[PDB]
């Protein structure tokens, strides 16, 4: 670019329209441990 | 319907070998007396196990015996640095609370283990392999998706890593192959026809003399006069060998502020 070289592989513009359906995933702060007394 | 006996019982023919490791006169005398009356002694304990009765280990006086744990330099200090050396003493001193804690596994070795994948995840793999060898890979997409869905994510990470390890182990075994199957300069053009009809015994001490002067009686009749005459001859040959000497190389570890190369250590300080 402006007196600078940034080596990157060939960009694929088709990756923009990649169908990625969102999946359910819930985090439970406060859950089960490995062992109990 | 007699109880089964282990192979050790036929070696000793008794269940009560009073084996005590403590080698003092009092202990071995009492053990010999107890070994003789063990048939009618109510205070008798087995040291040879069986199917019907368990047994005790080796006795150490009144306590029990266990070998000294293999020397281990790992330890953890409490009050002051003890500089523990496992080779400085014969028997390992007991760990005091305020002095030291030794490494875990007094009697332990290094092994390789593997987790067992879940049963439902195993069944999906068996279903894919079976469907593969019968219908081919191209008609097993559904069975492949069942593996990605049912197997937990940690199992899939283990399956992914096994392929990468065995790829590494494959390259390592093949590099050993290339070094092994490489023909050295002293074996150029030599085949199995040039091998001598010798076996392992033909290279032992009886047939091939070791490189030591007193391995046999070869030099036992050598007098001092013949020694002086030999020193003259070995110095005559050095008038042709000493003419050349390798050149001193530059020191790659000159800078002490640089990570030094692990160079071959000198034979002598």
């Amino acid at each position: 670019y402006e007196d600078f070289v940034f080596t990157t592989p060939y960009f694929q513009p088709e990756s923009t329209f990649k169908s990625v359906p969102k999946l359910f995933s819930d985090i439970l702060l406060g859950g089960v441990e490995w062992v109990y007394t | 319907k007699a109880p089964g006996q282990i192979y050790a019982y036929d070696i000793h023919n008794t269940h009560y070998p009073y084996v005590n490791i403590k080698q003092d006169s009092q202990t071995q005398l009492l053990a010999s007396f107890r070994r003789s009356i063990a048939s009618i002694n109510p205070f008798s304990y087995r040291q040879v196990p069986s199917q019907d009765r368990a047994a005790f280990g080796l006795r150490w006086g009144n306590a029990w015996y266990a070998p000294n744990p293999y020397p281990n330099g790992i330890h953890f200090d409490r009050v002051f640095p003890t500089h523990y050396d496992p080779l400085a003493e014969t028997n390992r001193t007991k760990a005091n609370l305020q002095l030291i804690k030794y490494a875990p596994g007094n009697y332990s070795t290094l092994v390789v283990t593997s987790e067992k994948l879940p049963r439902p995840c195993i069944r999906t793999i068996q279903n894919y392999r079976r469907c593969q060898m019968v219908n081919g890979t191209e008609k097993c997409n559904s069975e492949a998706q069942d593996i990605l869905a049912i197997c937990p994510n940690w199992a899939l990470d283990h399956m992914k890593e096994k392929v990468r390890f065995y790829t590494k182990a494959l390259a390592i075994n093949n590099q050993t192959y290339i070094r092994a199957m490489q023909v050295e300069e002293y074996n150029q053009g030599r085949t199995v026809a040039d091998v001598a009809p010798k076996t392992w015994i033909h290279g032992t001490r009886q047939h091939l003399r070791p490189d030591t002067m007193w391995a046999d009686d070869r030099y036992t009749n050598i007098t001092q006069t013949e020694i002086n005459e030999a020193i003259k001859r070995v110095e005559a040959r050095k008038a042709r060998e000493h003419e050349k000497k390798p050149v001193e190389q530059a020191n790659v570890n000159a800078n002490t502020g640089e990570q030094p190369v692990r160079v071959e250590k000198s034979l002598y300080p």
């Binding site: 999946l23 | 492949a144 593996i147």
Partner: protein
Amino acid sequence: TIFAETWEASEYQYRNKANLKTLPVNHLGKLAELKFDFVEYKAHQLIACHLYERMTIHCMNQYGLFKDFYRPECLDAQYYFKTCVELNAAYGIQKKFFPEHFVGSPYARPVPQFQQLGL
């Protein structure tokens, strides 16, 4: 940018880092601490950080900015509005350039292709 009134709380929690902050919905209880009369529609209270902005305008219209705006109900509204738009700007950038940090992203813990399993 969040293009809705509501967002999943878990989608703004970190998966590989300790969760020390959340991105909570607007605190509607602070709206009842305003002593004066004002008109507020329920259609504007759920969008992020905007309720605190409207509360600040209502407080700066009733009072000014000098010795009358300095009351606990009005200063918390301005502080919440400033803090809300700062946290959302940071979470928005982190959602855009670090989507793999959050729970629910397929890249937080990537599932391998079947060709990597060696079967």
